[PDB]
Amino acid sequence: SFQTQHDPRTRLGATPLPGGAGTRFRLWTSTARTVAVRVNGTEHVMTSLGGGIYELELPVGPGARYLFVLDGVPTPDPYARFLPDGVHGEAEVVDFGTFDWTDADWHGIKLADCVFYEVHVGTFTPEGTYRAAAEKLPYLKELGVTAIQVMPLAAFDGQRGWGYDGAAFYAPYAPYGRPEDLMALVDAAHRLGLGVFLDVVYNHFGPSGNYLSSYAPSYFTDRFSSAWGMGLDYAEPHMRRYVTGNARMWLRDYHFDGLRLDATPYMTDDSETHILTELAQEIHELGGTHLLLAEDHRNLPDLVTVNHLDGIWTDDFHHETRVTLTGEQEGYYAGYRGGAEALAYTIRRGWRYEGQFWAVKGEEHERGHPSDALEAPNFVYCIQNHDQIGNRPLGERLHQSDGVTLHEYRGAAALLLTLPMTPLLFQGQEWAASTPFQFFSDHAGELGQAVSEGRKKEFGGFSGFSGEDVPDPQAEQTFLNSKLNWAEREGGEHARTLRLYRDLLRLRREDPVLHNRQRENLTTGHDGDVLWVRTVTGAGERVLLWNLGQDTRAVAEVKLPFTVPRRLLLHTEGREDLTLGAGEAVLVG
Template identity: 45%
Template sequence: MPPSTVQTWTHGALLLDPARTRFALWAPDAGSVSVELDHGRSLPMQPRPEGWFVLEADCPAGSRYRFSIDGQLQVPDPASRSQDGDVHGPSRVVDPAAYQWQHQQWRGRPWHEAVIYELHVGVMGGYLAVRQALPALVELGVTAIELMPLAEFPGERNWGYDGVLPYAPEASYGTPEDLKALIDAAHGLGLAVLLDVVYNHFGPDGNYLQRYAAPFFRDDLHTPWGAAIDFRQRPVREFFIDNALMWLLEYRFDGLRLDAVHAIDDPDFLVELAQRVRQAVPAERHVWLNLENEFNQASLLQQGFDAQWNDDGHNALHVLLTGETDAYYADFADRPTEQLARCLSQGFAFQGQANRHGESRGEPSGHLPPSAFVLFLQNHDQIGNRAFGERLNQLAPPQALQAATALLLLSPMIPLLFMGDEVAAQEPFLFFTSHQGELAEAVREGRRNEFAAFSAFADAGQRQRIPDPNAPSTFHASRPQALAQQAAVTREWYRSLLQIRHRELIPRLPGARALGARVLAEGALSAGWRLGDGSLLCIDLNLSPHRVECAPLSGARLCFEHPAQAHPTGAPPFLPAFSVRVQLDDKTAPDGERP
């Protein structure tokens, strides 16, 4: 889309100097707009072309304000940088330069070094509590934390995907300065910080845009959350691109994960966003851009985005580990081992193949490097979208889960952990909100009806057992608690695997490419990669309860094996049940030798 020929203003309140602020609101459906300040001050805004209203006024940082639409409706700033009194309360003018950064020389980490730990700030206790947890994550071997969405949402409990004020960090977690202090502290420990952002919809409570800026949305296109955002409108594009730049430049986040971009019916917007980010960020900084995209649009991963969450890899592994084939797992019910092999060797399992609905899904991805895919055994969705939020360690055989964890942490794909994985947390991660009244009832019933496609909840009476998202107990039950003995054993398992990754793999990952994967038996496969230094990595995996024939790679050294075995005359020509073997050939054997 070409840029507008009329000036597009920066949305919201921009502090021009310590005493003066410029306010800008895109309100194409409004006849008049004023800024309402404390003590009854009302300042009319000046209309500008294309639906803009603008005002410069004496107004220092910390001032509270609202916008009055046609003298009838008072609303918070949709680009509010901070809220006083939740999403319906007044907005605050913020000085983005007020925080004094302690680690200004931080330039980020190269993408191939990423070991990502996804967490929910509220469940962990707020920005300060997350900050206190950072040293333990560094000791574990994590190199980046990823925060679930922080955009201001109604109430104090929410996953974050119901945010309605994308520029304002959730106040119940702390102040904007507390968030910057968390990022600053992470940088001081060598940790990158990513933020999950939602650019595909607004939450249902506290979004007033339809009242004065209906062109923000499309009448002809809907998403699961309502009318689609209209990215054909230049002010709409700038609203979200400026938001991305705010997080990266003002808050110094090291990257963004864009939620559910398949619900954005304008890939050109995504390409422009990536281009604008790359242009704005200094060349010496490492900034990561990741996607969640059910459409498996591999083409986007060559247009400014580093990687995509690989749901296909997770789904195939989940079916192999648990045997579950309900709902979307049905796409992986018949050939999960073959689909996992395709993920390891080509990126996506679905590269244009038909899904369970008979619809073509995905684009060819075999030309992309392994680092273009973020692999995980669990994340907020894959736990929280279960009716009772069970974790994988409650669903899979322990030895099989250990083998799958070794694959996760020792393959050339980028690994992602979810909070609590490393201590075998028994607590669920449930879906929680803090809506009120009719909306609370609608969310409660909607949540229960989501599971009608699962055999265990086909009966409406069974669905009534599903926890109420709005109950405070649902939120509090989701706090992971470490049980000392099991936590220590599991944590050491993760730490030892990540030590191997840092020592053996990360230095060799730039330039790595997949050589292929072959199915050995149902639940077992062998995959190989040519690493950037020419060495050959081979991972043999058996998630079945049966021994499988598989000779070791000739001349390669054993980096890791589970369960460990004695090898008086060399490694045996088979894989025991629930096992993994990782070998590295430093002599750069020919590509065709294995797998």
């Protein structure tokens, strides 16, 4: 009985009309006294309908260029579907019905079948475009990942950026390609049987290019704010519909298979029906198999059980793993001991913090909720992602941090990719890429000059930010140094690491016991610095043993509360015998 709040007839922005009649322009403004649309340079007064809604139909088609004129001030359309000259320019009218899709028989992907691969379009290839990314899809299919996780595409200011400064949520960022280039990427992924997910940012707008307040200040509220901008007022239905209409566009019009909702703790809403619940209703109304995930640090099961999201990016696993390997304790890493026993516990519980005191300085509070309701696929785990690389002072990858060996890096991959939780990999992780992933931006004027100090303040708990070698986010070189080097994977230890990732992803796909997706069938423990993870189903038994010590441990001498299986299925260093050098792992069955 849920009825969508969206009807193409009343869609805000510029929408092509049936029968070649042109385009319908609509906006909401609470404050303007004169309202016009300027199309291809010509101004036309719009009709007032009441409730601050204005409309006009004109015989212009796709490709027409426009903005709105509010009390004589030319103002970009917040509902723009494309901004070819950037966030301060004219929008282009887009028709979503002309692209020739070939994915009519694609039926999406289930979360339990997802192995995510996080892509930043600008750095993923030299060209930094959708078209170039599409040419790497056969490589990703063969690698064995099943869903691409694309970092945000909403238009932001400047010529490069991560995406979290997006300001025009409906307009794919022009430097990456035109709307049809994005559609071609998704179509190509679906032809290869790969899902495609999009990172969307519904907790804040970026600091340049957000003109919503020019139309109605009440899109926003001073009731609360995030670390990155003013509060989006989800008590205002037009604000709710801004993001639910956006979600529906990506899924329906661009054929994405799911969305990853950035920083859901800062989507503050005290409405009877929470905006997250309504987002789920609105995307489900499309009548497909589209998924919603939350990036949420609160360890709150209700995101799944009440808001009806499909899963949660949960960092406790990542953090416990990193601290295990480095011993680092700055910032949020002070929340974790690390080690085999600690990792066994965090896996057993899904997340570590279920209501106990988080004792980190300046942050002391009771964190989290019981994880019991959540099943394995509801937890998205990783050992690398954009934040856990890029928010480090020098943007170094896990194998690049002091004290981490490539053997430890390879062992960590085996843990991640054999667990029944839903894994994510960051681009280049699979070949132990040599390049960092640094924070880069390209803002104009004083805003641009402020980025570096904003970073140092936001991450001031990390002493490396007060050093002298922090890469300037605004420098071209910082962007270029984050580009993947595709050549390097063909040789040496990059190739060795890649072979292991291929072998792990094959086993995950093929092994009848690792097909398990039930926490009931998963147990963990430790003996000294050796972690064990056991899966038992009707199909048999598997055990992963990871030696997190700096000595050698024979599997036969690991004390276990069950009889260890005898058959060696995969060793991370390709050894014949059941013995674990420092940092090494083995899967037995």
